[PDB]
Amino acid sequence: HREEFPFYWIVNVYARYTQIMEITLKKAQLDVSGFRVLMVTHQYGKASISQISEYAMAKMPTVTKIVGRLREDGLVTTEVMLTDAGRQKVEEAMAQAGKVFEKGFKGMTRNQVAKMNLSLAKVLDNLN
Amino acid sequence: HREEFPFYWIVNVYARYTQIMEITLKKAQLDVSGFRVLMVTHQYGKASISQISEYAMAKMPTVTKIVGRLREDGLVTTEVMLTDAGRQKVEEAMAQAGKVFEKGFKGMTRNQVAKMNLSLAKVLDNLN
Ligand SMILES: O=C(O)Cc1c[nH]c2ccccc12
Ligand SMILES: O=C(O)Cc1c[nH]c2ccccc12
Incomplete structure (x- = not known):
């Protein structure tokens, strides 16, 4: 297969990443939407739902159904909403995700990773 | 919001890209899965389903249900399968997607875009 497709690796990194974070965060009782929110x-x-x-990468009626699962589970409380022993859920979550990011960027320099994210942010300005 | 998240821009480029290609390819009667297959x-x-x-970024039972929509619509025919006036569908599709890629990478050098895709391919080796 050829990259006659400049987004081939965006998509493949995105799919392998989503796949890993699904099963990692199921350790910590979370799906990716829950983790982003x-x-x-x-x-x-x-924060407001807006x-x-x-x-969070979701239209407001997902976020409102997501925030309501997290209200009911004592991870967010308070228009505007705030974290609780969510503060403990996010330690648990980012510990797991830190293992994912450590493996992810292994053998890559700080500058490589920064230039990659600068270039990707130019792709987004352009798409927006 | 902070990139304390090295995949923030992979995900955002991926979501804005998927969004644009959904509506572009609806011009050409296609969804993204159909277009990838x-x-x-x-x-x-x-090609085989395997x-x-x-x-294509799909487990085989999606591909088999995708290839069967495309069989029934005279875009693929022939275990193994091949394109027809699919050959015309892919001109139509890549014309549209070429507009998407042209806008996408505007004002970016060839080397920037190559270094971005080299770095992203190191992220994938590592995740695999
Ligand atoms: O969606 C994209 O442009 C990237 C991509 C990933 N797999 C593909 C298979 C066929 C055509 C394009 C892609
Ligand atoms: O999924 C990722 O790691 C990237 C990302 C995109 N939006 C986010 C919102 C909160 C936390 C992480 C992300």
């Missing part, structure tokens, strides 16, 4: 709220501290909905 | 067969000329199933 917690992390957006974590950086914001207290704001989560920007970054 | 045709292209794998095209490079192979005549072989398509490697590259």
